[PDB]
Design a protein around this motif. Structure first.
Motif, PDB file in Angstrom:
ATOM      1  N   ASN A 114       0.826  -1.195   0.000  1.00  0.00           N
ATOM      2  CA  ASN A 114       0.000   0.000   0.000  1.00  0.00           C
ATOM      3  C   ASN A 114       0.864   1.249   0.000  1.00  0.00           C
ATOM      4  O   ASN A 114       0.698   2.132  -0.851  1.00  0.00           O
ATOM      5  N   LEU A 115       1.828   1.311   0.916  1.00  0.00           N
ATOM      6  CA  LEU A 115       2.672   2.492   1.024  1.00  0.00           C
ATOM      7  C   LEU A 115       3.455   2.714  -0.255  1.00  0.00           C
ATOM      8  O   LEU A 115       3.782   3.855  -0.601  1.00  0.00           O
TER       9      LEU A 115
ATOM     10  N   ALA B  46      -7.055  -3.566   1.944  1.00  0.00           N
ATOM     11  CA  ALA B  46      -6.003  -3.702   2.934  1.00  0.00           C
ATOM     12  C   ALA B  46      -6.569  -3.778   4.336  1.00  0.00           C
ATOM     13  O   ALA B  46      -6.035  -4.510   5.173  1.00  0.00           O
ATOM     14  N   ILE B  47      -7.652  -3.054   4.606  1.00  0.00           N
ATOM     15  CA  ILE B  47      -8.351  -3.228   5.872  1.00  0.00           C
ATOM     16  C   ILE B  47      -8.744  -4.686   6.032  1.00  0.00           C
ATOM     17  O   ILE B  47      -8.402  -5.343   7.028  1.00  0.00           O
TER      18      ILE B  47
ATOM     19  N   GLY C 150      -5.272 -17.821   2.282  1.00  0.00           N
ATOM     20  CA  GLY C 150      -5.446 -17.898   0.843  1.00  0.00           C
ATOM     21  C   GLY C 150      -6.718 -17.225   0.376  1.00  0.00           C
ATOM     22  O   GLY C 150      -6.761 -16.638  -0.708  1.00  0.00           O
ATOM     23  N   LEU C 151      -7.774 -17.306   1.179  1.00  0.00           N
ATOM     24  CA  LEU C 151      -8.988 -16.586   0.839  1.00  0.00           C
ATOM     25  C   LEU C 151      -8.795 -15.093   1.048  1.00  0.00           C
ATOM     26  O   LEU C 151      -8.982 -14.294   0.121  1.00  0.00           O
ATOM     27  N   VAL C 152      -8.368 -14.702   2.250  1.00  0.00           N
ATOM     28  CA  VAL C 152      -8.259 -13.285   2.565  1.00  0.00           C
ATOM     29  C   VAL C 152      -7.304 -12.606   1.604  1.00  0.00           C
ATOM     30  O   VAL C 152      -7.644 -11.597   0.970  1.00  0.00           O
ATOM     31  N   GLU C 153      -6.110 -13.167   1.446  1.00  0.00           N
ATOM     32  CA  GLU C 153      -5.140 -12.575   0.542  1.00  0.00           C
ATOM     33  C   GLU C 153      -5.672 -12.516  -0.874  1.00  0.00           C
ATOM     34  O   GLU C 153      -5.350 -11.584  -1.620  1.00  0.00           O
ATOM     35  N   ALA C 154      -6.506 -13.478  -1.258  1.00  0.00           N
ATOM     36  CA  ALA C 154      -7.068 -13.431  -2.598  1.00  0.00           C
ATOM     37  C   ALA C 154      -7.901 -12.174  -2.768  1.00  0.00           C
ATOM     38  O   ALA C 154      -7.765 -11.454  -3.766  1.00  0.00           O
TER      39      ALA C 154
ATOM     40  N   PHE D 176      -5.513  -9.528  -3.737  1.00  0.00           N
ATOM     41  CA  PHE D 176      -4.928  -9.558  -5.075  1.00  0.00           C
ATOM     42  C   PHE D 176      -5.935  -9.143  -6.131  1.00  0.00           C
ATOM     43  O   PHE D 176      -5.621  -8.325  -7.006  1.00  0.00           O
ATOM     44  N   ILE D 177      -7.148  -9.688  -6.067  1.00  0.00           N
ATOM     45  CA  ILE D 177      -8.175  -9.295  -7.018  1.00  0.00           C
ATOM     46  C   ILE D 177      -8.334  -7.789  -7.002  1.00  0.00           C
ATOM     47  O   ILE D 177      -8.269  -7.128  -8.046  1.00  0.00           O
ATOM     48  N   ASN D 178      -8.489  -7.219  -5.811  1.00  0.00           N
ATOM     49  CA  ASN D 178      -8.586  -5.772  -5.712  1.00  0.00           C
ATOM     50  C   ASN D 178      -7.354  -5.120  -6.313  1.00  0.00           C
ATOM     51  O   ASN D 178      -7.462  -4.182  -7.112  1.00  0.00           O
ATOM     52  N   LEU D 179      -6.176  -5.653  -5.992  1.00  0.00           N
ATOM     53  CA  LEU D 179      -4.941  -5.076  -6.498  1.00  0.00           C
ATOM     54  C   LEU D 179      -4.912  -5.136  -8.009  1.00  0.00           C
ATOM     55  O   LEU D 179      -4.317  -4.271  -8.661  1.00  0.00           O
ATOM     56  N   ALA D 180      -5.538  -6.157  -8.586  1.00  0.00           N
ATOM     57  CA  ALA D 180      -5.657  -6.182 -10.033  1.00  0.00           C
ATOM     58  C   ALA D 180      -6.588  -5.082 -10.509  1.00  0.00           C
ATOM     59  O   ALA D 180      -6.210  -4.258 -11.351  1.00  0.00           O
ATOM     60  N   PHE D 181      -7.790  -5.016  -9.939  1.00  0.00           N
ATOM     61  CA  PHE D 181      -8.770  -4.080 -10.458  1.00  0.00           C
ATOM     62  C   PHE D 181      -8.351  -2.642 -10.212  1.00  0.00           C
ATOM     63  O   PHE D 181      -8.627  -1.767 -11.043  1.00  0.00           O
ATOM     64  N   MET D 182      -7.651  -2.383  -9.108  1.00  0.00           N
ATOM     65  CA  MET D 182      -7.099  -1.054  -8.905  1.00  0.00           C
ATOM     66  C   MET D 182      -6.250  -0.651 -10.093  1.00  0.00           C
ATOM     67  O   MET D 182      -6.413   0.447 -10.640  1.00  0.00           O
TER      68      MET D 182
END
Ligand SMILES: COc1nc2ccc(Br)cc2cc1[C@@H](c1ccccc1)[C@@](O)(CCN(C)C)c1cccc2ccccc12
Ligand SMILES: COc1nc2ccc(Br)cc2cc1[C@@H](c1ccccc1)[C@@](O)(CCN(C)C)c1cccc2ccccc12
Ligand SMILES: COc1nc2ccc(Br)cc2cc1[C@@H](c1ccccc1)[C@@](O)(CCN(C)C)c1cccc2ccccc12
Ligand SMILES: COc1nc2ccc(Br)cc2cc1[C@@H](c1ccccc1)[C@@](O)(CCN(C)C)c1cccc2ccccc12
Ligand SMILES: COc1nc2ccc(Br)cc2cc1[C@@H](c1ccccc1)[C@@](O)(CCN(C)C)c1cccc2ccccc12
Ligand SMILES: COc1nc2ccc(Br)cc2cc1[C@@H](c1ccccc1)[C@@](O)(CCN(C)C)c1cccc2ccccc12
Ligand SMILES: COc1nc2ccc(Br)cc2cc1[C@@H](c1ccccc1)[C@@](O)(CCN(C)C)c1cccc2ccccc12
Lengths: 81, 40, 41, 207, 81, 81, 81, 81, 81, 81, 81, 81
Positions: free
Chosen positions: H67-68, J21-22, J58-62, J65-71
């Motif tokens: 994030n940072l 990230a929250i 694996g669920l939470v981190e997923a 990642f999905i968000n990190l992709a769409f961002m």
């Protein structure tokens, strides 16, 4: 002109009271949870457990009112108008 | 037409999944109740 | 899409039709059957 | 929409027809007997647990007809009629009729029990007199909660099955498959929820 | 003119104080919960527990008051003005 | 003009400390909660329990101060101004 | 025009009520849990616990209404319009 | 001009660091609570129990750093400027 | 013109209903936790635990549907207009 | 022109990474808490709990990642242009 | 023009769905936690806990999907246009 | 023009995915917490606990998939426009 500052002021004052109400409600509920779960064990705890609870509720709510004060300060006699 | 092609593919997939995984336990439980009634 | 029309009374009537069908046909024979299974047990 | 519901009424009616044909208390039950009996006995154990069958027996038929009606509706929504069919609950009219009938039924049964002059005030004062003004919202909440939920979920599917259709077919088959897979479960769970909360509202309406 | 930045400043100060109040209320509450729960059990313990609780609150409010202070910076001095 | 960037900067910076104070308050409250519960359930372990808490808080506050520093970067030394 | 001052208000008010709802929604729950669990563990106490509960909610709700009140103040009376 | 872009970018970057800090504080706290409680209930555990901790922290703090980093990408290397 | 007011009414109403959903969901879930745990740890309690649960859910729903109520007022009547 | 779209796009990408990230921090912590408490309660239990944990992670981190992709899609591909 | 209102409506509906998502996810999790924990405490309780479970999961979801029913109303059927 | 609606759409979709990821992460995490603790408590219940866990995860992930779908709707289909 003053209108834009006033709208910003009401929006910030909404945020401040909203966050304050969140903190106050959830904290008071948690304190009440501790109190209710303790008074469940032994009744004689009541007059005792009331002391920390009013401390916790005392601090938690101590945030809201202060926030509430700043709320007025945003919406009434707004800074920088 | 195209969305119908995809729809029927998907309906075949779901029917496959239910048939293979969900149907066996359902029918076995139904048969267990059936036989338990067979006692009387 | 939150403004009703006469569709409402039609669904109420068909639902009460199914309810009468059930209350008369299904529920009594199945209650009798539950009682008779409790007997044979 | 009326036709989308008529199909479900005719299926449930044909199933009651098949039961009337098949039922055997001595012999081995067919499928339909076991399905009907399991639903009836679940709801009967539930009503027995809170009110007792002897005080409010009239709720069992309503509960079971609601469960079968909405369950069959949601399951039928799965069949690949995509290209006329759309889940009936997607329309506010159906869910309104159902929830409003449940509301009027159990409130009128409370009035019939305590009396027209007696049940309203007792319902308002409710479980704790300090909550008297909240109970009204707790009362007025009871019907609305039933309606906008059953709508909100099934509508949430009716749109989504359309939105997925936005895809090309090869991509389309995967999200539609997953969604319908879990939509069977979600519809069944919302039906059980509707029926069980109807039972509980009946119960607390009596006492 | 500086009206725009003043609206932004009031909103930002509102965010500072809102998040600060959420944190302060919920933190004082979670601390008071442990205190009430560890005083419902074994009340002769209480004199110990006041030492860490006042430490924990000391940190929570250490976040809150300074937040308020930066709020006073945004609202009454408006950096960039 | 620069007004818009200063407004966006102040808003972002307030978000930074709002989130930072949520994190810090709730995190150090949970940490203090574990500390209180442990010093209650095991006072002999007091001197042990302080070692992880200063670690735990150290990370929580480690995030928040890091945020405040970047806040100073957003507000006073606005990028892109 | 002056319309802007109302627009933010309808936004700001939401932050008072919406966040307030959070404090109302979770607090009424966190308390009831301590109530419900008591009714699970110490069934005879169903009366006693009701007082520690009604005070907890009595505080939590005290926030919500207050927010509600000021909500109208933002929406209907529109300070500084 | 592009000024609006930089303003939006600072707002976004603040939201990123904010959510990151909320997650970091609260997750490090939820971890440290298990740590304090686990070194109270089993004082010898300190040796092995740090390893799971360094895992969960490793996942929380990393979410902050990613994030940072992206904040630094938003503000200092603004996409689409 | 009045378009801005309509946008603000929708946004504020959305905040109201969203915070309401947050609070109502989390509260109903925390209440269900006590209900499910009590019914797991003693089934005979199923008769009594249903009493306080809907006493608490009622207090939570009676927040949601209140927020929703005001939300309608925001969107359909637009109070300030 | 595209300027407004890009400013909104950065703001949205930030909201996505923030919520993500929250969720990620709080969930990874809630998992590490069960892991730490279990590994305290059973030293030899490691080789079991890591399986449910890397699952939960694996669920939470997923969700991250999905968000990190769409961002990225929002910020580095700018849909709607 | 209508465009301003529609942008606002998308934002509001997004807040609706986001709050509903937070609520429903966290609540379904808190409920599943009690369920998993009861089934761990009593591996045979599974057939018993489904009743109180879906009572909760529904009353939880009774927010989210309701919000969704209103979300479309903002996005697809914009009031006050 | 359409650009403004697109910007609102990016922002709204961001809020939707934000709330979605918060809910999904925290919920999968709470469920995993229950699972980890239960599998720490009953090494043999793994196969029975995987059932309610996948049920809870299925509900929460259904919420998140619905949210993702409405995000695709806002960002790519952009209602209105
Ligand atoms: C619990 O009461 C308190 N405890 C405090 C503890 C510490 C500090 Br430092 C300040 C405290 C302040 C108060 C109240 C108070 C009462 C009268 C005058 C001034 C302040 C309060 O501000 C609390 C709001 N809560 C409930 C969110 C309040 C304001 C307005 C209307 C209220 C109506 C009903 C009840 C309380 C009302
Ligand atoms: C409990 O008080 C503290 N403990 C601290 C502990 C550690 C640190 Br590092 C800072 C601390 C700071 C304070 C107060 C303080 C003390 C002195 C000067 C300024 C501020 C406080 O800021 C706390 C607000 N709380 C209660 C939400 C406050 C400000 C304004 C009005 C208050 C009214 C009533 C009570 C507290 C009031
Ligand atoms: C103990 O406090 C810390 N722990 C840290 C832990 C890790 C890291 Br990496 C940085 C840390 C930094 C600090 C302080 C600090 C400030 C300046 C220089 C050095 C250390 C701090 O910034 C903390 C405020 N907290 C509540 C966010 C502070 C600022 C202003 C007034 C304070 C008054 C009282 C106490 C602390 C005060
Ligand atoms: C423990 O710290 C870490 N753990 C990680 C874990 C995983 C990953 Br993949 C990256 C990690 C990165 C780090 C630090 C780091 C930064 C730069 C280079 C190397 C390591 C960190 O970024 C963490 C911030 N935390 C504490 C909120 C940091 C930045 C700035 C100031 C700090 C002051 C004090 C401590 C950490 C400080
Ligand atoms: C009983 O509950 C309370 N306790 C309080 C405790 C302290 C204070 Br100072 C205010 C309190 C206020 C109330 C209610 C009330 C009942 C009757 C009249 C006024 C207020 C309530 O606030 C319910 C909010 N809950 C559900 C989150 C409410 C406000 C506004 C409109 C309502 C409409 C219908 C029902 C309740 C309505
Ligand atoms: C554990 O990590 C994962 N678990 C997953 C679980 C499920 C799924 Br389906 C995807 C997962 C993906 C990953 C990483 C990954 C691994 C390989 C390629 C791409 C992405 C990750 O995205 C996680 C970030 N977390 C920690 C906040 C990552 C991205 C960028 C930099 C990282 C730096 C350090 C660590 C992780 C870093
Ligand atoms: C575990 O996977 C699932 N379980 C479900 C369970 C119930 C329901 Br009703 C929906 C479910 C949906 C899914 C995936 C899915 C399957 C098909 C289509 C769309 C989405 C998923 O949403 C999971 C990510 N989770 C952690 C948020 C996903 C979204 C986006 C990118 C992914 C990349 C890689 C893997 C999974 C990816």
């Amino acid at each position: 002109p003053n209108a834009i500052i006033t709208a910003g002021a009401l929006i910030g004052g909404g945020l401040i009271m909203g966050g304050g109400a969140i903190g106050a409600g959830i904290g008071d509920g948690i304190a009440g949870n501790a109190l209710i779960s303790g008074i469940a064990r032994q009744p004689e705890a009541q007059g005792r457990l009331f002391t920390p609870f009013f401390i916790t509720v005392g601090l938690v709510e101590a945030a809201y009112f202060i926030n509430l004060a700043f709320m007025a300060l945003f919406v009434f006699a707004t800074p920088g108008l | 037409m195209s969305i119908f092609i995809g729809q029927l593919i998907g309906f075949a997939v779901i029917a496959f999944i239910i048939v293979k995984w969900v149907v066996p336990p359902v029918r076995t439980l139904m048969r267990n109740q059936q036989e338990a009634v067979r006692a009387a | 899409f939150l403004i009703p029309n006469g569709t409402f009374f039609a669904v109420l009537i068909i639902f009460l039709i199914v309810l009468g069908v059930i209350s008369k046909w299904v529920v009594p024979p199945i209650s009798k059957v539950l009682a008779e299974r409790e007997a044979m047990l | 929409t009326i036709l989308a519901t008529a199909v479900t009424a005719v299926i449930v009616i044909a199933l009651a027809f098949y039961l009337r044909a098949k039922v055997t208390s001595t012999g081995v039950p067919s499928g339909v007997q076991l399905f009907w009996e399991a639903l009836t006995i679940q709801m009967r154990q539930q009503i027995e647990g809170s009110i007792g069958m002897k005080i409010a027996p009239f709720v069992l038929p309503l509960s079971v007809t609601i469960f079968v009606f909405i369950l069959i509706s949601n399951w039928l929504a799965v069949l690949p009629l995509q290209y006329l069919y759309k889940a009936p609950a997607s329309d506010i009219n159906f869910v309104l009729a159902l929830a409003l009938f449940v509301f009027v039924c159990y409130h009128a049964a409370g009035i019939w029990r305590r009396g027209i002059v007696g049940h309203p005030i007792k319902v308002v004062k409710g479980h704790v007199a300090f909550l008297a003004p909240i109970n009204i919202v707790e009362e007025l909440a009871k019907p609305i909660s039933l309606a906008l939920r059953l709508f909100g979920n099934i509508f949430a599917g009716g749109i989504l099955v359309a939105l997925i259709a936005m895809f090309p077919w090869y991509i389309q088959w995967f999200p539609n498959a997953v969604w319908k897979t879990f939509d069977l479960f979600v519809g069944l769970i919302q039906a059980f929820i509707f029926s069980l909360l109807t039972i509980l509202y009946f119960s607390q309406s009596m006492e």
